[PDB]
From a paper:
We reconstructed the 3D structure of the holo complex rotational state 1 using 71,196 polished single particle images. The final structure of the state one has an overall resolution of 3.6 Å. After subtracting the EM density of the membrane embedded domain from the density of the whole complex, we obtained a focused density map of A3B3D1F1d1 with two EG peripheral stalks and the soluble arm domain of the a subunit (asol) at 3.5 Å resolution. This map allowed us to build an atomic model of A3B3D1F1 (V1). The secondary ADP in the semi-closed site shows a lower occupancy due to low affinity of the semi-closed site for the nucleotide and partial flexibility of the complex. Upon dissociation from Vo, the isolated V1 moiety displays only ATP hydrolysis activity accompanied by rotation of the DF shaft.
Residue numbers in the entry:
A (entry chain G): 169 to 211
B (entry chain A): 194 to 577
C (entry chain B): 1 to 577
D (entry chain C): 194 to 386
E (entry chain D): 5 to 463
F (entry chain E): 240 to 359
G (entry chain F): 360 to 463
The structure:
Amino acid sequence: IPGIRAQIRFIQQVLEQREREDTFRLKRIKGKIEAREAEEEGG
Amino acid sequence: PVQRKLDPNTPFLTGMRILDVLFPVAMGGTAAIPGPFGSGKTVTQQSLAKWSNADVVVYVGCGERGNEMTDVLVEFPELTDPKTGGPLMHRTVLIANTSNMPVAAREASIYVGVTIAEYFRDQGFSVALMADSTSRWAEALREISSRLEEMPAEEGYPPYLAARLAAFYERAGKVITLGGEEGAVTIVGAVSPPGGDMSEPVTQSTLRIVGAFWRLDASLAFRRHFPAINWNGSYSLFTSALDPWYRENVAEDYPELRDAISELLQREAGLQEIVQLVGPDALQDAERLVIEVGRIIREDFLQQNAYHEVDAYCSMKKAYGIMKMILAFYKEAEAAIKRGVSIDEILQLPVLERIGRARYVSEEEFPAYFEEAMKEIQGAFKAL
Amino acid sequence: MIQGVIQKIAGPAVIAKGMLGARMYDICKVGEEGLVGEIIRLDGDTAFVQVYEDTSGLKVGEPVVSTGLPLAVELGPGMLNGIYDGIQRPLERIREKTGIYITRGVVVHALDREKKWAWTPMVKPGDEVRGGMVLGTVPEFGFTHKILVPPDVRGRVKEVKPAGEYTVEEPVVVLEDGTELKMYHTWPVRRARPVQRKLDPNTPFLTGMRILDVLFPVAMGGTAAIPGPFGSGKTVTQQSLAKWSNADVVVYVGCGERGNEMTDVLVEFPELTDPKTGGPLMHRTVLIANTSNMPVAAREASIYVGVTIAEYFRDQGFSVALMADSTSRWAEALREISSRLEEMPAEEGYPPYLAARLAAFYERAGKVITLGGEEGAVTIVGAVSPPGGDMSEPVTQSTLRIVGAFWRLDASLAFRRHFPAINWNGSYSLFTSALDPWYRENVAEDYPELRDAISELLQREAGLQEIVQLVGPDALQDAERLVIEVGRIIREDFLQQNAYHEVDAYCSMKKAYGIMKMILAFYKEAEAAIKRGVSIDEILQLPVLERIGRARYVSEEEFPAYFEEAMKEIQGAFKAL
Amino acid sequence: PVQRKLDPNTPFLTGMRILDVLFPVAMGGTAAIPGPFGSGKTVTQQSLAKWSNADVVVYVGCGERGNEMTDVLVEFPELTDPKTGGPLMHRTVLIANTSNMPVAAREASIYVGVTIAEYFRDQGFSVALMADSTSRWAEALREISSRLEEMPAEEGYPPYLAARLAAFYERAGKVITLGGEEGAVTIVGAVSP
Amino acid sequence: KKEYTGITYISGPLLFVENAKDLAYGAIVDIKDGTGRVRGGQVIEVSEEYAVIQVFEETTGLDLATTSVSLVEDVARLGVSKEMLGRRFNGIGKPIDGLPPITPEKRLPITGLPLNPVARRKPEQFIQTGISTIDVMNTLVRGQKLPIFSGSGLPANEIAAQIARQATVRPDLSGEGEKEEPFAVVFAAMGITQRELSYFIQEFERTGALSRSVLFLNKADDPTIERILTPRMALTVAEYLAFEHDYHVLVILTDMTNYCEALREIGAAREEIPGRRGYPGYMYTDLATIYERAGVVEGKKGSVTQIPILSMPDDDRTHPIPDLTGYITEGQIQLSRELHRKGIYPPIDPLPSLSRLMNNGVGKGKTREDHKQVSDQLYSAYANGVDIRKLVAIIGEDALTENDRRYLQFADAFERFFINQGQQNRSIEESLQIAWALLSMLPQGELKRISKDHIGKYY
Amino acid sequence: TVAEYLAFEHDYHVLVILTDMTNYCEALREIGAAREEIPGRRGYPGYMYTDLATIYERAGVVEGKKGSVTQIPILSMPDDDRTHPIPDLTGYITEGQIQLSRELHRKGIYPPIDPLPSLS
Amino acid sequence: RLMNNGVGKGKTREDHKQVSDQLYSAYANGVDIRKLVAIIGEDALTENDRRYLQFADAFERFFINQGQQNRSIEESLQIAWALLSMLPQGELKRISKDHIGKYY
Ligand SMILES: Nc1ncnc2c1ncn2[C@@H]1O[C@H](COP(=O)(O)OP(=O)(O)O)[C@@H](O)[C@H]1O
């Protein structure tokens, strides 16, 4: 039982780790989109 | 447009014993065959395309293999459709779009296929769409979104995936068109998860909208146990409106036989849990009998090789015959085990191999083969 | 402050136009009707204003007025026996207007501006007053309510008003600088009140529950944490504690919890007793209510408002007792606020504050000597109800190591009818060492050793029970069955308190000491008998067992005589057989 | 530049039994010693440095505590080179850049080490570079990248870590230089996950 | 009238209109094309330079030259009445039916105004559904939110229709004016397919339970904004009826998972940076906004009780949707896949079910005396049987005791007589009679939770 | 700073003791994460090794002088993980570690120290 | 995948895919009995489970391991039939009785 609990803990940690990278890339994309649309008044 | 949409009340016979007896699909329905690579999401669709009961067939390939699409152009104008005798390529409108052609032609091909099928339905036939790997559609949308430079939802898929999929799956069903006739568009859309996990947005959004759902398993496909339909992750929602049709056209206690088979499978599962815990020798005799009947079912009634000569199209009466034989054998074996005879003798009874190989028969001598084997079982299991 | 017009309206965010001078974190009422918000950003000549209410139906061009004061409460006479929202809004006077709902933009004052009190001066002109001193007194029903000087004010008195009747808006003292001091003042909830110095734990917080007050104590500055499952009788424990504690005032804070505390407290304890006057217990309570569908700013300000009101009642010289409910629900609200502010999360989603705001709430509690030469205390007992019930999430992982005592309410113990249900194998306390001297000087001289012996008895009973049930409690040597029967005596007639009885709800320290003494004496005489070789059946059939079984149900007047007679009778009747 | 790159057919005898019997390394090859903290990586690398069969040794350290550098500094000059008989520190060019010193100097140190080893190969000897904490090097790369403000890869590191590591490890092998005489550059790069 | 031309951007769902600072945030507009066909909309992010609009259905055929936008309403309102008690609406609130559009008495706003925590009271009385499990072991008192945790293939629509047809309130036991308390039900279904729509219509108009129901249907391929608006319309009509005409209402919301997914999609298309596990950060507030409009107040006689039917997505209890739903509501009911496959209807797993407000709705003066004790004893005996079944499978009926034999037979008969009931309508007296008959199969002295004054008159 | 002063200038033998390096790491993660700088591993930023090494390596013994500095940083493994970033970085920087035990504490032993996983 | 079209009767030998299917089934059974052993113990095994176990080990030792030698389709099929003969007749439900009689 403790071995299975350790495995679960490791998998859960990795899965949660691979969400903050996504949030970070999304925030950067939003910053770039704001920087671009702040210059698109007309043209 | 149509006048009004009817309620489906007749099955969609497809040849496979699992997908006909256990998990049926009405003649207006929908389905989805998701699974990792190396399961047979193409062999099963080609078998549905060459052994169905429809009038026309449209085979859409949205990101498939060139060899997988050219092994149809070559063989189908040689086989004989099972309704008129002509070639099978006189009812197919297949729409090929392989994996190196342009990328927006994917969604283009999906919509073209559905509109052609609706035209034929309005004409009056009974079409059968077959969309392959709707996931390629999703990845095309993902690329076009990454070019539009927008804000993506989970895993990059744009935030209008589910709307497109619902609008595409909701133009399928029996209807009475503007000329006072009947038509039907059945859809069987494959799905390819990126790791096999049924948690992808496409694998989830394609639930909650469909009827049957035929989940393929990987280990059954490593054992070379085809088809690899997982018998406890799948489900069907049409199996309660088709019972009048079964009672009218197959048998009278076919629903009861189907219920008994399903109950036996999905009770044997629980015992298999304790089996894997302790071992299949500390069990009682009735328990080992249940395990062995489950294995006989799993290897003689839910297995089907699409490359045999006569075991590639099993009809309803043949499936019902095999089910009857299995149930009678189990009943008499239960009685004998109560009496006291041993399970090893019960297994060495050669009616085992008889009702096992009873599936490689043709369809002409079965009405006599089944009678002979039934009487032989009834005799030999009271002889001892 | 100068007004300003709206520029953009996107969801709950509003961007003001023409505010060159507005401060950060100020309440400003945006709109035509007042939708009090909060200034969170300033960029050149604008200000982002986070509104609390719906924001639907506004237009661009409506005025935005600032206030200048960052989310204060109104500390004064009138808060006893009141129900308040998260931002100190009186719910009854709100119901008097809007019907049964809570409309948008209502404006109501916390302290009633139309009641009259009996002011009695306590100074004279030409006198010297500084922060934290007393100006007068006014009796609020139940006890005498002082009127402090607003901290960080001073001067020389010039004029007081004669004793009589005046409301909360008659300036009652006027200093030399011309400042007018009224009966109340405002204090921003995010800044702790100042004192002279913080004292140390040397006095217990006598609850009334024998388990807690004997085995797991907490000083009168402590910070305990009490989880709760769904069906372990937690509400009755909390109500008994608030009824028989030694606090002078009790403040209750709930952010997400029911609307049955209202009926329960307000109609049971009044028709029942406040066990020092007989009148309602709601005459020392400041209940605060918050359901799930109320704004997140309301939830956060709820926690902080509770602790600030408690700090005030301490600074008056009393001893307060807080009961924070669902710190987990508070953390949920805080996480929602954060994810709205577009902040990089941490493990489990909570922002990287959950460990700092928590420790900024639990560190406002402790015995202290106020600014006017007095004594005060604030003690907190905050519930921690995880979504699943695992003490490994971030909220619990921080609450533990921020708190002292810990009281593990369990549900199986409740299913076995063992009330109260506090698992002694999982609970623990840290206020025993530094509290022993009070025990030696005020209870008895061997109280520590009696307590430790009882704890060892329980430890050994459990360690034995590990394998008892295998072969049944009959195939063990006589010492083992003796240990088991003594453990049963302990945990069935000392560690169990029927909180609904009349004379069995408040076991005093001397009473608990006597009971422990009798149980240990019976164990000593039973081991002295077994050592000689008597049977293990007379031991259990004796009458001293029943005599000590009816110990706790006796009153607090006849207990010394009962104790003497019981010890004499045990020592007597344990030699004849 | 070199003439042509030979193929190693000679063992690199380090002294230890496991690494000279079970898992040997040809005298032109590469290796790696990953492993968690407190397992003996420093002691193993110093033992290779003080008992190998190379002509010269170039100890690089980028992120290792200065106590190790001081250990080798105050220990070697009283040992003996087991090929000639002189002091051991007369065939060592150790390079030191500890943890508290600046960061980018880490990668500067890696490259300086490899270039010194290439020179001593070009003279006709057979050297044995022993890097340390290529993981620390990758951390320095990540810091500089995140300052440049570019998009990351799996777990922060920039998406050219693999190319950089491949070049660094591919500068190692037995070769027959422009003078005609042979030479070799072994490499033993520690890692610390 | 037909003002506000001059748009300057069109992409996907969005549409930027140039200078228009007279539209209120959150309004509702229409978009007339250059060919006549009109559409819907909803203003958001209005500022001084432009005003982002979001169309309802689609945007195929719009151009920057021939396009105009016009106002409809400053907020979203619904025209409610009492004549809408045999009708069938959809989404926005127009009739998908043949009957004419009714005339309203007041046009309420579809949201807002939470109840007051000092203007409530405590729910006491009980409601009868006909299903014997949800009666004898998981009672459903008024003013309670009791979700149903369905599954992927399990029958949820059929259970919903059965409850809707059968559920009534029993004033015979309390004692009051019979024809004084009416009953209604406001079934509202989001994201149904085409089969389920006809199934529901036939299931209602077969028995005739249409005379006191109001349906709000949201066929799956409709836009997402309507699937967001639907429960608001349902609950608005429900609490209007209750707190204005003393009705007793029962609201059933179908497949809250579809609502949650639509909500996440709308947020993403509005550029929200999802909070946790892809779902928006405000989802707890959003759910608690509709799981909370139902209760009982003091001074009135009505009540509103909710039964949100959701479906654990991957057969999981730690997914955010079931997590927050169990966090906000008080109770649960679990459909069982094993009982389904074995052939029992209605399949209700009675071990992991629960009802927090049950002990407040059963007892002398409400239903009967032996209610809670019978429930406790049935729970205990069923758990015992379900354990000794696996024990038997491993060891054999050779090494058992008589009490274990009897418990095994009890468990089997309980699964085959008390759960499996089909389309019957069991009253509470009939359910208790079946329960006592089933408990009789055990010897006295084993009924270690019932009182003897009860064992006497029964058993 | 005070330690290095007293030691290398007035010839003392200091002994620095830093309790709760975990609270320091929490403070560091919170102060850093407010500038949007690529959180490294489970929250804590990328340069946490650089910072911990910045403050640890200040303890040594110089030649010529006769002072010394000696550190004993007490830290609490967050959830008895020896694979948490804080204990991992600390073990990679410092030399030798003394690990308290949990089983010995139940049996009532003090100071509970299991000499199996500890060394210098 | 492109194997059912390139092998069979008239191309290599009329019994190729059948030996393939049977070898796969038998090896899967042996691999499962490996875990059964690891749970129970090698002496508490039925009389045919040991046959399957030994088939799996012989398969991994003679059919897979082949050094650097150039086999042929016929040599490899002879080895496959040698192995498949280690199991009893009648327990191979995949091959046809004709091939079963012709090769053994
Ligand atoms: N019904 C079947 N009978 C026999 N073999 C099958 C059957 N279905 C699939 N297979 C085998 O499984 C493989 C699956 O092929 P294919 O359908 O191209 O991949 P996938 O199933 O992953 O789409 C094929 O090589 C075929 O040999």
